[PDB]
Amino acid sequence: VSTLIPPKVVSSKNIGSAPNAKRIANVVHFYKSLPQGPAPAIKANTRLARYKAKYFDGDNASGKPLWHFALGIIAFGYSMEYYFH
Template identity: 55%
Template sequence: MSFVTRRALSTLIPPKVASPKAIGAAPDALRMQRVVSFYEKLPRGPAPEVKATGLLGRYQAKHFGKNPTAKPIIHAIVFLLVVGYAQNYYFHLRKLPDELLGPKTFRNGCR
C-alpha cells in the first residue's frame, strides 16, 4: 500500500486505543491513559431521539420527519392564496362601488 493510500485511510479509521502498559514510556503512557479514559467516557450505541418542542419543531417533526408528506406544499399554497386575497381586497376590492358587491342587506352581517 502506498504512503498516500495509507494516509488517506488513516483519517477514516479512529485512533487505536491501547492500554498504557503496552506503550512502555512513562510520558506516553500518561498521555495514552488520558486518551483511553476519554474514549471510555463516550456514550455507546445510537444517540437518543430528540423530542421536538415548539410549534415549528412539532410541525417539522410531523410533516418532514420519518414519514414526509405533501401537506406543507398544500399549506403554502393556501397561505399564499389567503394573503393574496387579503392584499387584493385591501388595495382594490374595498374601493369598488356598492352595486358590484351585492345587496346591502347581506353585507357586514346586517339584515
C-alpha cells in the same frame, strides 16, 4: 550455517502492511458512534419544531405542507385583494 529468524518480526511489521490503515481507521470509527439510535431527542418544541416533526422528517415527507404553503399564498394576496381591489 545458523538459525534464521523470521517467525517473530511482527513487532515493527504491524505498521507497514496495508490493512493496518483500515484497522486503525475503524477502531477510531467505532468508539464514539452512539449504539442504537440513542440520544435521539425525538420530541422538541420551539412553537414550530412540532410542525417539522409532523411534516418534515424522513417518515412523513409528503408534499402537503407545500399544499399548506400553497394555501398560504391563497391566504395572503386575497386578503390584500380586500385591501386593494
